[PDB]
Amino acid sequence: AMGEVSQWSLKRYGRFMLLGSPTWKVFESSEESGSLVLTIVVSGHFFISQGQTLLEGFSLIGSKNWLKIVRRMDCLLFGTTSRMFRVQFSGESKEEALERCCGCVQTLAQYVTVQEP
């Protein structure tokens, strides 16, 4: 809750696994596992964490070269060149989840273009 960071809670995070043989590993906010949180630091770093474990971390600075993002409603798909993952924002209503997503897009968009399908 600093002026140093922006944070949003995620319903779920899916890591694309092909870049047995699962396609996705899917993480959710649990009372035991920990809350799923997307963090953007004012310095330009992006994290996804579940409790203490960092599932994703990289710089958004000069990311126009190697990072693609697409928004669909309350979801984002991220592609780095290769790695891929998707995220859905949480909320009591479809509207609150979209409000969360949109506020996040507003921060991401300072660093990279967030595209539509």
């Binding site: 798909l77 859905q88 479809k94």
Partner: peptide, 15 residues
């Protein structure tokens, strides 16, 4: 190709 494919498959999570 795979990207474009997974942009559409993001519907798996949508209502």
């Amino acid at each position: 190709d795979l990207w474009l494919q997974e942009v559409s498959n993001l519907s798996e999570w949508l209502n």
